[PDB]
Amino acid sequence: GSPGIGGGGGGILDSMVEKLGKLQYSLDYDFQNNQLLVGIIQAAELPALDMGGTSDPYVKVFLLPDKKKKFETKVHRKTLNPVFNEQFTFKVPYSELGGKTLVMAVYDFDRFSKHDIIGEFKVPMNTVDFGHVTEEWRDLQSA
Ligand SMILES: [Cu+2]
Ligand SMILES: [Cu+2]
């Protein structure tokens, strides 16, 4: 925006991953039935509301670039450490899965306003190890 002579910072700190919580999920391709199984297990350390209070988290799960309706977990009210314990199934033949990307996005449910996103992350199908169940914690990223 300018020569950048004045500024200080701060800039390195602003680049770091924000503490927006983490989501544990699992993933397995069922070659018998030809479907992708996704386990939305639990989230931890979701951020407290600006001025105290807990959020009402739920997770949207879907595949890009597919235009189909997103799956959603139940809403867990007033908790920053929800255990979802839900499984979703995507009926997609393996051959068609390679170019897709799984997205998991945690939102804060509200009945009277747009639901604020808490954070999200993506899992490209082309870097998943289909020979073993995948299970990991992922830090939620801004957006
Ligand atoms: Cu093995
Ligand atoms: Cu093993």
Side-chain angles (χ1 to χ4, degrees), residues 27-31 34-37 90 92-94 97 130:
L27 182 169
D28 195 34
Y29 191 85
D30 175 357
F31 288 98
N34 304 121
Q35 58 196 13
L36 177 71
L37 305 178
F90 295 90
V92 180
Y94 172 84
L97 197 56
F130 290 89

Side-chain angles (χ1 to χ4, degrees), residues 2-60:
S2 69
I5 300 169
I12 298 300
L13 295 176
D14 195 38
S15 71
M16 300 291 160
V17 178
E18 289 165 331
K19 311 204 93 311
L20 301 181
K22 54 183 181 181
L23 182 76
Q24 193 187 36
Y25 75 96
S26 56
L27 182 169
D28 195 34
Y29 191 85
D30 175 357
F31 288 98
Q32 179 192 244
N33 293 305
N34 304 121
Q35 58 196 13
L36 177 71
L37 305 178
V38 178
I40 301 306
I41 306 165
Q42 63 178 322
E45 302 186 79
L46 299 177
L49 298 178
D50 181 26
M51 297 183 298
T54 62
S55 47
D56 299 330
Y58 68 98
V59 190
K60 295 188 184 182

Side-chain angles (χ1 to χ4, degrees), residues 22-120:
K22 54 183 181 181
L23 182 76
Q24 193 187 36
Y25 75 96
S26 56
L27 182 169
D28 195 34
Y29 191 85
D30 175 357
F31 288 98
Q32 179 192 244
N33 293 305
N34 304 121
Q35 58 196 13
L36 177 71
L37 305 178
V38 178
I40 301 306
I41 306 165
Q42 63 178 322
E45 302 186 79
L46 299 177
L49 298 178
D50 181 26
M51 297 183 298
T54 62
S55 47
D56 299 330
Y58 68 98
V59 190
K60 295 188 184 182
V61 185
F62 53 96
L63 287 169
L64 293 178
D66 300 25
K67 307 174 188 178
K68 279 159 288 303
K69 298 177 180 181
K70 304 179 175 62
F71 293 120
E72 292 189 350
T73 65
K74 293 175 53 295
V75 171
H76 287 251
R77 287 169 167 83
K78 306 190 178 303
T79 178
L80 302 179
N81 295 282
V83 169
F84 301 103
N85 273 2
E86 294 191 40
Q87 170 186 286
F88 299 100
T89 301
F90 295 90
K91 298 184 61 185
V92 180
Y94 172 84
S95 64
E96 301 182 5
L97 197 56
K100 298 179 191 296
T101 296
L102 181 61
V103 185
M104 285 160 282
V106 186
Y107 286 85
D108 183 357
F109 175 84
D110 191 278
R111 188 163 305 273
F112 313 103
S113 298
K114 72 159 64 294
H115 307 166
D116 295 343
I117 182 73
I118 295 174
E120 54 81 23

